[PDB]
Design a protein around this motif. Structure first.
Motif, mmCIF file in Angstrom:
data_model
loop_
_atom_site.group_PDB
_atom_site.id
_atom_site.type_symbol
_atom_site.label_atom_id
_atom_site.label_comp_id
_atom_site.label_asym_id
_atom_site.label_seq_id
_atom_site.Cartn_x
_atom_site.Cartn_y
_atom_site.Cartn_z
ATOM 1 N N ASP A 130 0.827 -1.201 0.000
ATOM 2 C CA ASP A 130 0.000 0.000 0.000
ATOM 3 C C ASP A 130 0.865 1.256 0.000
ATOM 4 O O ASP A 130 1.979 1.255 0.525
ATOM 5 N N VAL A 131 0.346 2.326 -0.594
ATOM 6 C CA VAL A 131 1.071 3.589 -0.662
ATOM 7 C C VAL A 131 0.830 4.430 0.586
ATOM 8 O O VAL A 131 1.288 5.569 0.678
ATOM 9 N N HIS A 132 0.107 3.861 1.545
ATOM 10 C CA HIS A 132 -0.195 4.558 2.791
ATOM 11 C C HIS A 132 0.693 4.055 3.925
ATOM 12 O O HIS A 132 0.503 4.419 5.086
ATOM 13 N N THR A 133 1.665 3.216 3.580
ATOM 14 C CA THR A 133 2.582 2.662 4.569
ATOM 15 C C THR A 133 4.032 2.923 4.180
ATOM 16 O O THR A 133 4.370 2.971 2.997
ATOM 17 N N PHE A 134 4.888 3.089 5.183
ATOM 18 C CA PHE A 134 6.304 3.345 4.946
ATOM 19 C C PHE A 134 7.170 2.582 5.944
ATOM 20 O O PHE A 134 7.042 2.759 7.156
ATOM 21 N N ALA A 135 8.051 1.732 5.426
ATOM 22 C CA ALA A 135 8.938 0.942 6.271
ATOM 23 C C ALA A 135 10.380 1.027 5.782
ATOM 24 O O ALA A 135 10.644 0.951 4.582
ATOM 25 N N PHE A 136 11.309 1.185 6.719
ATOM 26 C CA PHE A 136 12.725 1.281 6.382
ATOM 27 C C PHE A 136 13.565 0.408 7.310
ATOM 28 O O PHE A 136 13.286 0.306 8.504
ATOM 29 N N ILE A 137 14.594 -0.220 6.751
ATOM 30 C CA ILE A 137 15.474 -1.084 7.526
ATOM 31 C C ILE A 137 16.771 -0.365 7.887
ATOM 32 O O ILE A 137 17.523 0.057 7.008
ATOM 33 N N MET A 138 17.026 -0.233 9.184
ATOM 34 C CA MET A 138 18.234 0.432 9.661
ATOM 35 C C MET A 138 19.167 -0.562 10.345
ATOM 36 O O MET A 138 18.752 -1.658 10.723
ATOM 37 N N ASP A 139 20.427 -0.172 10.502
ATOM 38 C CA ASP A 139 21.418 -1.029 11.142
ATOM 39 C C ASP A 139 21.508 -0.734 12.637
ATOM 40 O O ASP A 139 21.838 0.380 13.042
ATOM 41 N N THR A 140 21.209 -1.741 13.452
ATOM 42 C CA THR A 140 21.252 -1.590 14.901
ATOM 43 C C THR A 140 22.380 -2.418 15.505
ATOM 44 O O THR A 140 22.246 -2.963 16.600
ATOM 45 N N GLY A 141 23.494 -2.509 14.785
ATOM 46 C CA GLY A 141 24.630 -3.272 15.269
ATOM 47 C C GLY A 141 25.576 -3.673 14.153
ATOM 48 O O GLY A 141 26.030 -2.830 13.382
ATOM 49 N N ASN A 142 25.874 -4.966 14.070
ATOM 50 C CA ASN A 142 26.774 -5.477 13.042
ATOM 51 C C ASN A 142 25.988 -6.070 11.877
ATOM 52 O O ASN A 142 26.049 -5.567 10.755
ATOM 53 N N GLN A 143 25.250 -7.140 12.152
ATOM 54 C CA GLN A 143 24.452 -7.802 11.126
ATOM 55 C C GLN A 143 22.962 -7.641 11.408
ATOM 56 O O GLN A 143 22.160 -7.487 10.486
ATOM 57 N N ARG A 144 22.599 -7.677 12.686
ATOM 58 C CA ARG A 144 21.205 -7.537 13.087
ATOM 59 C C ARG A 144 20.667 -6.159 12.714
ATOM 60 O O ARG A 144 21.159 -5.137 13.194
ATOM 61 N N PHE A 145 19.655 -6.138 11.853
ATOM 62 C CA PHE A 145 19.051 -4.886 11.412
ATOM 63 C C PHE A 145 17.571 -4.837 11.782
ATOM 64 O O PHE A 145 16.883 -5.857 11.766
ATOM 65 N N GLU A 146 17.090 -3.643 12.114
ATOM 66 C CA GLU A 146 15.693 -3.460 12.489
ATOM 67 C C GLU A 146 14.922 -2.742 11.385
ATOM 68 O O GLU A 146 15.495 -1.967 10.617
ATOM 69 N N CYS A 147 13.623 -3.003 11.311
ATOM 70 C CA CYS A 147 12.773 -2.383 10.300
ATOM 71 C C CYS A 147 11.541 -1.751 10.939
ATOM 72 O O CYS A 147 10.642 -2.452 11.405
ATOM 73 N N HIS A 148 11.506 -0.423 10.959
ATOM 74 C CA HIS A 148 10.384 0.304 11.542
ATOM 75 C C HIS A 148 9.370 0.688 10.469
ATOM 76 O O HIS A 148 9.731 0.938 9.320
ATOM 77 N N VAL A 149 8.097 0.732 10.853
ATOM 78 C CA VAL A 149 7.030 1.085 9.926
ATOM 79 C C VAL A 149 6.234 2.282 10.433
ATOM 80 O O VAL A 149 6.063 2.461 11.639
ATOM 81 N N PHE A 150 5.749 3.100 9.504
ATOM 82 C CA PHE A 150 4.970 4.282 9.857
ATOM 83 C C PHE A 150 3.880 4.544 8.822
ATOM 84 O O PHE A 150 4.144 4.570 7.620
ATOM 85 N N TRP A 151 2.656 4.736 9.298
ATOM 86 C CA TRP A 151 1.525 4.996 8.414
ATOM 87 C C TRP A 151 1.504 6.454 7.971
ATOM 88 O O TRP A 151 1.482 7.365 8.801
ATOM 89 N N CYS A 152 1.510 6.671 6.661
ATOM 90 C CA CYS A 152 1.493 8.019 6.107
ATOM 91 C C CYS A 152 0.103 8.376 5.588
ATOM 92 O O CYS A 152 -0.560 7.559 4.952
ATOM 93 N N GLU A 153 -0.330 9.602 5.866
ATOM 94 C CA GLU A 153 -1.641 10.065 5.428
ATOM 95 C C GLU A 153 -1.524 11.368 4.642
ATOM 96 O O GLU A 153 -0.887 12.328 5.074
ATOM 97 N N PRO A 154 -2.151 11.401 3.457
ATOM 98 C CA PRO A 154 -2.912 10.263 2.931
ATOM 99 C C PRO A 154 -2.010 9.098 2.531
ATOM 100 O O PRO A 154 -2.285 7.947 2.866
ATOM 101 N N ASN A 155 -0.935 9.408 1.815
ATOM 102 C CA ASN A 155 0.007 8.387 1.370
ATOM 103 C C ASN A 155 1.427 8.728 1.810
ATOM 104 O O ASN A 155 1.650 9.711 2.516
ATOM 105 N N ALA A 156 2.385 7.910 1.385
ATOM 106 C CA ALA A 156 3.783 8.127 1.732
ATOM 107 C C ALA A 156 4.553 8.729 0.560
ATOM 108 O O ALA A 156 5.641 8.266 0.218
#
Length: 185
Positions: free
Chosen positions: A93-119
């Motif tokens: 969907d174009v109303h959602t936004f997720a990005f993967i960031m580096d939280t260490g060496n190999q382990r990476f986290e992916c946060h999501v955020f709802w955009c209105e109307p869209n991203a």
């Protein structure tokens, strides 16, 4: 015997804030892969619902992306940096936004955020943040009083979806992040 408390230093810089919600955080195994990023979005969506996600302000600085809550400004829900950003994309969907960031060496986290109307404005800032300067508001809108009307041609498709799609297609892989060994001979 004497009390004493220490505090960090406030960083004030030209940063833009975007009104969005907070779905949650989902860890990923690979830094890239639309199949992985999107696999983390639904995971969070299932747990908490749309109304379950609290409203927070997404502060995206020049080369940094800090997540601040609405109840407070000093509240840092998540501190992400464009430099760490390995891969970023948009969910089905174009109303959602997720990005993967580096939280260490190999382990990476992916946060999501709802955009209105869209991203469109969001995914545009984060993606442009990697390069540096951003265009933003184009200005050119819709006049309204057309002259020659009555023929097939120029479509009425908004330039908002045309882009939002690309993100959910190939996405944007931060170049600065080149520590892996995917260089073809």
């Amino acid at each position: 015997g004497s009390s004493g408390s220490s505090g960090p230093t406030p960083k004030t810089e030209l940063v833009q804030k975007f009104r969005v919600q907070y779905l949650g955080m989902l860890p990923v195994d690979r830094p890239v892969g639309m199949d992985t990023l999107n696999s983390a979005i639904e995971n969070l969506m299932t747990s908490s619902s749309k109304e379950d996600w609290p409203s927070v302000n997404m502060n995206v600085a020049d080369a940094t992306v800090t997540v601040i809550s609405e109840k407070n400004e000093e509240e840092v829900l998540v501190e992400c940096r464009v430099r760490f950003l390995s891969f970023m994309g948009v969910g089905k969907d174009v109303h959602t936004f997720a990005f993967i960031m580096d939280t260490g060496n190999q382990r990476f986290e992916c946060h999501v955020f709802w955009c209105e109307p869209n991203a469109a404005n969001v995914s545009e800032a984060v993606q442009a943040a990697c390069s540096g300067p951003s265009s933003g508001i184009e200005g050119r809108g819709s006049s309204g009083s057309s002259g020659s009307s009555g023929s097939s041609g120029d479509a009425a498709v908004t330039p908002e979806e045309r882009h939002l799609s690309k993100m959910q297609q190939n996405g944007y892989e931060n170049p600065t992040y080149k520590f892996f060994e995917q260089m073809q001979n």
